Amino acid sequence: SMARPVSIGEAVGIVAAQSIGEPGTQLTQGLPRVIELFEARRPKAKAVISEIDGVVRIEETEEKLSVFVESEGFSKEYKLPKEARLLVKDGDYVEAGQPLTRGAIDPHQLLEAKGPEAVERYLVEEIQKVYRAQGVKLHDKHIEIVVRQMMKYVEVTDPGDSRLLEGQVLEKWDVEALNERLIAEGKTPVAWKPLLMGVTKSALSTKSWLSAASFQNTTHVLTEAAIAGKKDELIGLKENVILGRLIPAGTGSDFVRFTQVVDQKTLKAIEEARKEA
Amino acid sequence: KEVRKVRIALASPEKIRSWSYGEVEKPETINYRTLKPERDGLFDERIFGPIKDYECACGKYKRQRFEGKVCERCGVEVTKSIVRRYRMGHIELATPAAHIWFVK
Amino acid sequence: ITIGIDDAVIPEEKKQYLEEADRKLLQIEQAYEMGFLTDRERYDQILQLWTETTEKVTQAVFKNFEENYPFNPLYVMAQSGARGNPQQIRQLCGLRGLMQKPSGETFEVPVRSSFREGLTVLEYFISSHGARKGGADTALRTADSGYLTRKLVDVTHE
Amino acid sequence: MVQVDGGRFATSDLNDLYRRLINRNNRLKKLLAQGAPEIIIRNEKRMLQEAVDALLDNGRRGAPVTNPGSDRPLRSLTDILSGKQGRFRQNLLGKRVDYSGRSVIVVGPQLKLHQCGLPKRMALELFKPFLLKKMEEKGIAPNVKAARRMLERQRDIKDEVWDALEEVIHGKVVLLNRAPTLHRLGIQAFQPVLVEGQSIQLHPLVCEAFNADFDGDQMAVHVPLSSFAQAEARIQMLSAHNLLSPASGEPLAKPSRDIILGL
Amino acid sequence: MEIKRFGRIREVIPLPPLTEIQVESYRRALQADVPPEKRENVGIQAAFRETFPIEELVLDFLEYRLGEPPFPQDECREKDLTYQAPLYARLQLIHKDTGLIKEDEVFLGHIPLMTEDGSFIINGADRVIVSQIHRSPGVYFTPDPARPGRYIASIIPLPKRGPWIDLEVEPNGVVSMKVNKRKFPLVLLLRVLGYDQETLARELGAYGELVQGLMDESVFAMRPEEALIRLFTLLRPGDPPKRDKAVAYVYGLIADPRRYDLGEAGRYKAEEKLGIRLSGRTLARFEDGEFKDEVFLPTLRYLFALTAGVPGHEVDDIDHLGNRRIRTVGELMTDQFRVGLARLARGVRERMLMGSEDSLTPAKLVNSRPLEAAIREFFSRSQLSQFKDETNPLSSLRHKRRISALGPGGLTRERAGFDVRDVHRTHYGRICPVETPEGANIGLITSLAAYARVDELGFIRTPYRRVVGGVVTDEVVYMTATEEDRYTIAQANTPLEGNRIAAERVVARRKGEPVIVSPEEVEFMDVSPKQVFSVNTNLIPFLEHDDANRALMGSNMQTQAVPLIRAQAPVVMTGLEERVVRDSLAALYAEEDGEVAKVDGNRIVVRYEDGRLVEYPLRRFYRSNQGTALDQRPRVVVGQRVRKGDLLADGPASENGFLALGQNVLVAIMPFDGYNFEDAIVISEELLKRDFYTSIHIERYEIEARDTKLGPERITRDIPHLSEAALRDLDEEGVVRIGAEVKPGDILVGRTSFKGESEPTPEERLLRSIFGEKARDVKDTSLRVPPGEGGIVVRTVRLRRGDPGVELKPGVREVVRVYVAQKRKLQVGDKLANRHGNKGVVAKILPVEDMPHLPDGTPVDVILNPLGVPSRMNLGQILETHLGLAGYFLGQRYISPIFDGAKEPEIKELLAQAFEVYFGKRKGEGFGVDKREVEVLRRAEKLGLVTPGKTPEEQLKELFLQGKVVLYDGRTGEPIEGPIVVGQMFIMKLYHMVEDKMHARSTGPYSLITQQPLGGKAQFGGQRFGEMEVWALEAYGAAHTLQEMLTLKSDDIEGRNAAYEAIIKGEDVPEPSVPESFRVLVKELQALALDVQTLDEKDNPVDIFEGLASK
Amino acid sequence: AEPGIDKLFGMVDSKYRLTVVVAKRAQQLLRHGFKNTVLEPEERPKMQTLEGLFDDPNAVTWAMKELLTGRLVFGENLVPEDRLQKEMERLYPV
Ligand SMILES: [Mg+2]
Ligand SMILES: [Zn+2]
């Protein structure tokens, strides 16, 4: 909206959510498919992709369609029903992540196969496919923002030398900071696994107890407020609104919250009165 | 100054009594005939301060000239009445009870 | 810029295209009489035929407007992009096309007329289905859209 | 617990909860003071835990206790905090507001882009305190009270008060708004110009940005108060400085139906 | 004047009584006329038959009778009561043993009575009941969703008369009964109803694949009563399974006609479906203690025959109109009455077990409270009991003929799908496909079609002519959808040569499908195209050139019209504009022939041919439900004969028996200086000069005076600190005198209130003691005008406690109600429409000389944007405009019926004659062509509009036949650069205006609870501020605006007080420190035994209260 | 549009810094009632009435004009604000 490098301290995420949800009132697969891709749940036409590279060796019995992805030493076999409209042929060497039949992809399979990055690229591609199919122009930037927010949470596989526990969930930043401190503390770093979770769960599992307390399931998350014994940091916006505080954005950003102004002449007089002492 | 972090934690009965200006005893809020808040009740002004500014309920001072001194003839001191907003009492139980949230 | 009823000009190729559609429908039913095809593919070919003739008469309307009346206000509104799609201009001059059932299956008989030539009662009773569907879809759509925006801004709020 | 005009007391149920707790508590103090048989001691402690439960949350265990002669349950502390009408959700997200107004809209073609029309009644009823201060700052009324009770009568509206009103709005800015606001252009800033009638005039080139048309759509109008809020409005939220979509960067103040038609 | 007609279709039947559904249903439900021995088993009579006797010493029922209202209808609505009659019942408490027959005539409360027109008067409010559609009872078959080759057999009784019945196929081959969300076998019930392996294999042996799958002999081991104990353990686990308890229980659920009933219509549908004939309307027959057969084995055979693919066995669509039935008002009050009777039945069953068994009058055996409370609750707070709308006569008519699916026993807004909103294949001629509200209520709320009648069974019947050979008859039979489903009905537009059909290959619906048929197989024919749509939709002329969307909006918008004080009938009508005025029960018509005797503005005396001298009073200046003037202007003069049915007096929104909603205004279609942009409409000052679009609205106010324990309230001419200069309009008792105008805030009723005891501020008390205005024992409770309103007081009403037939809530001494009217003209910012849905708000009134004008100097009055047309596909307004042009230049009105009306060449003929009578006339005074029209003519022939080479006169003729004439802008004199279309159009004025919309607030009152500013535009407050607006503000990041929005302009106290103080001090408003919401949240959290530690960045515990209320 | 707004964006790198600059400057000019300006009489924001021409009462116009001149040094931590306030009150009282 200004055709220029963005000013420091602007709140991207609210603009992002508004720009995403604005033309959703002009959608007739449509809005449930959009919700599905935001929920990352179990799809309907659950296609099967490759997981280990190798050639495709189809096997067509009249009642069963099987396929064999065949590496130098790994023949992984998949068994498909007859209605599965394929994407490949026999004698085709395909990559992991690449799908075999038509239909959408569950994202957890792609998380297993190709890590988080192709997951993010696939989600961006799907949402842009829907929105360009309906004829609505939208920069991918906001979708990138929210999907980066979606992949934030990580799982503690094994704690190692840490104070924390296994199977524990946290932010990627915290495990990264504590791991680089651990290798700066002579102790072993923690092993963490990247963990895709749904959008409502992504808002649910946050550390800022005020925002999630106010948010929803307010009874038991208020019992979580009773649980807490923690401190808050007032990083987001919702907590500053609910406490009525000056929000930390725009004019309220701490980069510009204390910018002095003065004239020339009386500034010079004050500085001269300073330097004479 | 200014606030930067907010820490939520448990309670403790000593700090409960630290916040409590006193004790509440009567099951009456205010009157119905006279509409007066009764003494040592829920709306008792000698706990939670007066309703109007710089006045005691006996009538010793009606002016800004004094501040904070407790007029003994009613029990309310001389102040701004908005300390009604920020003031708690307590009730000492005869037997301890469970904050039911940790139960429920 | 005014609108007259004579501005909705009907090109004469409409009925000739309809004659070709009539004799092709005749031939399709004749091939069904010998059992030379199923009724399924008959339905499919009929949908195909009506769709192709619909596109043809839309092209005929637009080249007629560009030929004879370039300052006709309806075609001016169309090319300017201020108001109007080509399909609305076809419904005002050519034929409405085909509508479908509440099951979504398309009727095997199209609306032969525009709005300018009037409609038979049955055609109005047909097109009411799609009109009701569109209104119901919008009235369903609004609140769920606001709901989506709510969840999104709740998760990205920082 | 306050007195309504009908004699009733608009009363929080917490007062009733505190009363029942104080009653049962001092009763059991008196009961232990004498050395009662233990059965009623156990029953009274049972009622004590029940009462303090109801105070913390009427509506967890068993029947949520009501008043005698009422089916409706009470409102506990959890009912105060949580819920759609609680503190956390409600009392900071979604409220009412002073210094506001509501009307219907109508096109005004002759305006510039950063202007909007205000009915004289509405601008009178909105900028009242500034008008009071300026009327005292002129020789029209000595204090605020004379100016107040001389604006009390609509016969007294001379022409000088209109001159003061058009003085005090010089460079002031108001906010236009239409429910429901999808994106951030749903609220705009505008400089006001006084007009006649009982309707808010509007520039054409912004109505499609509002996704608003003149089929009878209503409108809300607010006014910032602090000079900080004035600058916050006049730099960012002014319509003349907002031309491109934050969505994808296209001119939302593009021309429209009749304009494109004429060109 | 000339009233031309059109159309080539002559109908054979007229329209029925339009409101006959409501009044006919209730009049059937009452039977208040008939002697009691002929009261058939229906409604109140049927309910009294079924719920009696009481069985516990036995009391049974003889008959009932209806009393009389103590007050007439206008008196009842004056005193704000319920128009009702008491109901009395002749009763015989008969002990079987001692033969004591205590006979009495008990009193059983009141029953609300219908008005003449079909409304109800409840507490003075005008209400109405809307019919409720639902699924019909009986038996149905649906495809099983889980097992695709299988089906589910459903049996559904009357609503609230027991649960449904699900016959299901288990995965093995046995079939099972699912009742009360529970599965259990079916051979169990066969054994209970006496069906061994013998009978099952003997009759159902054709398909043993599920009958031997059904076979099991362990149930044939146990007898029906042991099977009954077994199923009592099954369906009621954790219960003592006595045989007597089991017999009584499953009799009460299966063979009880008192708590269970299959629908009589559902019984008829089952009898038609299975071909069998039922004895009763229950599931079993309680005989010999056991039960005997009703309909178990034909349904099982149908289920297996459909399972085996036998022809003549078909699943049934639940949304098909042969399977859904309507419930009128009479069924609803019958069922509510049945609920109240069952309540009093169990009440007296309680009461029968107490008391001395001899000294019992039956009057002292029954209460009347629960039944009267049931009926009163149903008429007051139920969902179907709508507050009846009376904006115009047509709106009341449409609200009378509404049809819902919502309410009790229906559907909720969450669980609403799409097919419930969809138009079925068989709505043709039974439900209007286009008349419905939009929004969330779309597809559910609707109205009846025009020629549609309802049977006693609840099925919509529809008229059709028979066709015999190639001859259509003149009789006509009503049918349902089911009887329509076995024929081939041609359309009504098909040409006829006498009764011989003129066409060759007809279009027809076979099973609702379009098909080209020979004339021989035509069995039936539609009556008229008017049988398709509703009465609102049948008003819109040229419906065959408008999209369904704008037709929907126009058909709904006609209800929101407002009656005008100089109203007009439209110049283009559809013929139906008199039957609606006749059956609306608004205007006044002559019953008998005779002569007009006395004409006055309040009453009409007529000498009849009988010689009975009859005077009708005239309801004059009547306030509507929504503040609309209603009156009956007279229409005749003394010394003038009448006929049976002539118009005597003009009702509201009517003219000479024709419907009159808007005005016929000249209008051209062109964009004008941006004022037409996005649907805004421009007018001239000529309309306001000749009082066009002017309305009258009566606003009613109210004030109660009651008894206060702090000293009761009194109403007088004196209140603390009132100048008499602000009081010169009251009477001596206190109310204003009739005739005075009033501005906002001025006193209507001066009411005292005896003061309590509290504290005023010392400075203003010092002001009162220094100025010279002391206080009294009382304080003010005066009724003043809410702001923005105002006008003339017309009528006052002063009720009191101590008057005959006044019934008030306790405490009230007296109440005052004041009627204030105002005459609203047309200003900027009001909302107009015409019949094709092209609506919009008016934008800019202009002086008349700016407006364009015809060559004769006649100016146009309304301007319309053209660009709202082609994205809407509503072309009918253009044909309306052409016809209105012809009718303007010839002075004549026209009738074009729906789908059979004036096409193009007839309009071309009429425009040719109109061009003659215009241009030859203006030529007749020696005024030829102008230069300006010559220039625009040759510019027009550069656009292919007229063929060139002609004289200007013939080209002008061609343009007039096109419906475009030249024009001259009044602002600048030169012609417009193209020919413009222009003609007359019928244009209404909508109900809502800015007066109950526009309000604004600086400061003022606050919440007595939450310290917020007030809410609602009636109560002076400010706007709702939704959270999406907060999101927009954060997207701009204007932070201080948000913080001052959350406290300073809202429920903060000290901040807003300091802000107002600084503004009247004239500086910048400062910034608050600790948040008010922050502080109260901290104290709420500390109330929850939870310490909250407000920190700085360096863990120093910062106080936010400054030690104010902390030790 | 406010005049020179593109050149005003040319001055400060961040628009929010510009906003808080003009807000604080307007607050100063209101608290010392326009006698502590940097402008000239011809640089004063005029306002045309039926009586004539007068100085504008809206401080924000003055602040934008002053920032368009270039006599206002701004930034962060040029001086502690308290001594600025004391010597501003001392040099420029009411
Ligand atoms: Mg609208
Ligand atoms: Zn007291």
Numbering used by the authors:
A (entry chain D): 1210 to 1237, 1254 to 1502
B (entry chain D): 3 to 106
C (entry chain D): 947 to 1104
D (entry chain D): 527 to 789
E (entry chain C): 1 to 56, 64 to 1118
F (entry chain E): 2 to 95
Paper quotes:
Mfd is a highly conserved ATP-dependent DNA translocase in bacteria. It recognizes stalled RNA polymerase (RNAP) and removes it from DNA, leading to Mfd-dependent transcription termination. Mfd can be functionally dissected into an N-terminal region (NTR), an RNAP interacting domain (RID), a translocation module (TM), and a C-terminal domain (CTD). Here, we report the single-particle cryo-electron microscopy structures of T. thermophilus Mfd-RNAP complex with and without ATPγS.
The cryo-EM structures of MTC with and without ATPγS (MTCATPγS and MTCapo) were determined at 4.1 and 5.0 Å, respectively. As expected, a clear density feature for ATPγS is observed in MTCATPγS. Although full-length Mfd was used, cryo-EM densities for only the RID and the TM were observed. The RID binds to the RNAP β1 domain, while the TM binds to the upstream dsDNA and the clamp. Compared to MTCapo, TD2 rotates by ∼33° toward TD1 in MTCATPγS. ATP binding then leads to the closure of TD2. Superposition of TD1 with and without ATPγS results in different registers of TD2, which are offset along the DNA by ∼1 bp in the direction of translocation, suggesting that the step size of Mfd is 1 bp. The interactions in MTCATPγS will be discussed in the following sections due to its superior resolution. The RID binds to the RNAP β1 domain with a buried surface area of ∼579 Å2. TD2 binds to the clamp with a buried surface area of ∼580 Å2.
